[PDB]
Amino acid sequence: IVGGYTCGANTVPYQVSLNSGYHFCGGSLINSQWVVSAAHCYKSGIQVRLGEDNINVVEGNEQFISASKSIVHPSYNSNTLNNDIMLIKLKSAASLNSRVASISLPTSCASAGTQCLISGWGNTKSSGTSYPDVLKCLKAPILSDSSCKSAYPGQITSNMFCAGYLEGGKDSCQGDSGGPVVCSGKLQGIVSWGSGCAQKNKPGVYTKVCNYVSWIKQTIASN
Template identity: 65%
Template structure:
């Protein structure tokens, strides 16, 4: 399942977040507003997690060593909403913890992708309900025009949209930082969107393929 590519962090027990694992297993890829908390410079990263309330014997708990946010991150527009988290020690790779592949190129419109996380299954005004087990959703990538029309003047070249314009299925609250895997490659991390599965309001993801050189250079320089 998709849990192979997920990490889970609990910031002070308040937010449930997940991050895609990058090709260097000591580094996790996330987005900024999901996890960046200046008060806490170290978080516990959980790998191999599936049911967050049960110890299943597959988990690895590793403290973060360093947060590296993208220098162009804009908190007003959410542009370049991407960061790397260096782990304090290497993870052990096995059938439950496996690195996700970085994209070799950007994905085409209409590509079906897997989005996963432990976010709320309902919008918060309906009373949030967080699942115990990892949730997974298949959703298509939408064209830049469709994305822009859904969110006029809010979409930058570093964002992609995925989901269904008819609504009803989308990533949701608490999924910030969740990975979007397309053809086995990490093409997006959940960035923002209006509420949960709203009609004509697809989810917005940081476009990972625009950041391949930054990710590789940052990892190489440690």
């Protein structure tokens, strides 16, 4: 997250870190057994880390639970990032508590202009590299479809939305991928892509979770 703020330990209790020997992507806990992330975060061999604040210190509220199954969306296209969504099943259910909690799936799609909370352990610099140890947060508004398409001509599908600031300076970034965009208390987006981070006229692009609720529900009812 570039231009964000330190969230505060366990104030984003649905945020997970995906670890394959090191943090590589975020995700969102949607119930005691299942995480939503980005399909481009697929790796074999994922351990889900819940209850994290500093990802490099065991502070005492973590749960580390191996994945048993990962399910990339059936229509994922890694070239365009259309349908950039994945489900990860935990080998055992998390113990839900004040620091490890699920986020609701949406009923309706969020609106342009809504301010959402985006979070992660990704890079904090637009130019260069600095990865935080503690979770960072950013409030960013959803942009109109027309503004999103103007920023990335020929690249935005109906399964994507833009959020952020066309002036630059505030965005998600590498290492935030897969993590949550929460609007009105529900999971509306997944950190997916963007041209660089926090550059002028190049806002973040997010997977539009409301288009996937019936796939998520039928998949979790079956696996």
